[PDB]
Every structure is written in structure tokens, then in C-alpha cells.
Amino acid sequence: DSFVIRGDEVRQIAPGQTGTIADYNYKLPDDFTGCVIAWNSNNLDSKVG
Amino acid sequence: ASVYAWNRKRISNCVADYSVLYNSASFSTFKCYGVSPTKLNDLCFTNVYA
Amino acid sequence: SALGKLQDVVNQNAQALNTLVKQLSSNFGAISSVLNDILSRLDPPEAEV
């Protein structure tokens, strides 16, 4: 599952958690097994404007 | 108000729609302990505080 | 109190049933001893606990 989200909104990507981005766009099962891995993308997905 | 002198406004005789808090992006943190945020609209409370 | 032997059986059975019924009012460390309150107040991850 590959997606781009904000830095403060990574905590909402967890089992048994709720949020604006976690409901309408991508919802995880409560008993989800596996891993969630993230790394910074500011240096490649951001511009001055 | 300040942390040592927190303002305590008692709430009564209301019919509250908690969607204005839950769905609003203006709140940087929504955490509940004894209840769940989505199910607040289905419950009746007295002795309410803020 | 001539018939106390049968009355003892009756009272023991009634007392055991009463104790069993009153155990439904103990929360056993949960937030409430009523299942409907837990079901109507919490999401499944914490309601499960």
C-alpha cells in the first residue's frame, strides 16, 4: 500500500485509530497484520512554491 | 485562560452536534478516553463540563 | 422448623441463583457492568477489551 500523507498524520495510520485521511481515503482493518514503513519525501516531492 | 486557572464552563440544556468538532480540521488533536468520538451523537449526558 | 432439611435445599438453590444473578451487576474491572452501554459508547477495539 503506497501513498503520500502529511508528517503529523502518520499516527492515524495505525490499527484502531481514526482520522480524516483514514476514513474517506484509506481505511485499515483493526486486526491488520504486517508493517507500516515511512520515510521523508520533502527533498523529492516539494517545491518552493 | 491559563493552565493554573483553567476556565470551567458547565454545559446544560443543550442538543449538541459533535460533528463540528470531529470533522473539523482546525483541531490538531482529538483524543477520547471513556467514549469514542464517532458515537457521541448517540448518547445523552448530564453533569457536562468544559 | 421440623422440615428444615428440605428448606435448606430450597434456600441453598435460591441463594446460589441469587448470587449468580447479582454477579451480572459486577463490572469486573470494565467501565460498566452493562453490555449495552459499552456497545453504545466505544469503537470495537476498546469495546472488545
UniProtKB/Swiss-Prot annotation, chain A:
Changing residue 43 to K: In strain: Omicron/BA.1, Omicron/BA.2, Omicron/BA.2.12.1, Omicron/BA.2.75, Omicron/BA.4, Omicron/BA.5, Omicron/BQ.1.1, Omicron/XBB.1.5, Omicron/EG.5.1. Changing residue 11 to S: In strain: Omicron/BA.2, Omicron/BA.2.12.1, Omicron/BA.2.75, Omicron/BA.4, Omicron/BA.5, Omicron/BQ.1.1, Omicron/XBB.1.5, Omicron/EG.5.1. Changing residue 8 to N: In strain: Omicron/BA.2, Omicron/BA.2.12.1, Omicron/BA.2.75, Omicron/BA.4, Omicron/BA.5, Omicron/BQ.1.1, Omicron/XBB.1.5, Omicron/EG.5.1; complete loss of interaction with host integrins. Residues 6-8 are annotated as: Integrin-binding motif. Binds to host ACE2. RBD also interacts with the N-linked glycan on 'Asn-90' of ACE2. Cleavage of S generates a polybasic C-terminal sequence on S1 that binds to host Neuropilin-1 (NRP1) and Neuropilin-2 (NRP2) receptors. Interacts with host integrin alpha-5/beta-1 (ITGA5:ITGB1) and with ACE2 in complex with integrin alpha-5/beta-1 (ITGA5:ITGB1). May interact via cytoplasmic c-terminus with M protein. May interact (via N-terminus) with host bilirubin and biliverdin, thereby preventing antibody binding to the SARS-CoV-2 spike NTD via an allosteric mechanism. Attaches the virion to the cell membrane by interacting with host receptor, initiating the infection. The major receptor is host ACE2. When S2/S2' has been cleaved, binding to the receptor triggers direct fusion at the cell membrane. When S2/S2' has not been cleaved, binding to the receptor results in internalization of the virus by endocytosis using host TFRC and GRM2 and leading to fusion of the virion membrane with the host endosomal membrane. Alternatively, may use NRP1/NRP2 and integrin as entry receptors. This is Spike protein S1. The gene is S. The chain holds residues 398 to 446 of 1273 of the full protein.
UniProtKB/Swiss-Prot annotation, chain C:
Changing residue 27 to K: In strain: Omicron/BA.1, Omicron/BA.2, Omicron/BA.2.12.1, Omicron/BA.2.75, Omicron/BA.4, Omicron/BA.5, Omicron/BQ.1.1, Omicron/XBB.1.5, Omicron/EG.5.1. It comes from the Viruses. Residues 7-49 form a coiled coil. Subunit of the fusion protein that is processed upon entry into the host cell. Mediates fusion of the virion and cellular membranes by functioning as a class I viral fusion protein. Contains a viral fusion peptide that is unmasked after S2 cleavage. This cleavage can occur at the cell membrane by host TMPRSS2 or during endocytosis by host CSTL. In either case, this triggers an extensive and irreversible conformational change that leads to fusion of the viral envelope with the cellular cytoplasmic membrane, releasing viral genomic RNA into the host cell cytoplasm. This is Spike protein S2'. It comes from Severe acute respiratory syndrome coronavirus 2 (2019-nCoV). The gene is S. The chain holds residues 943 to 991 of 1273 of the full protein.
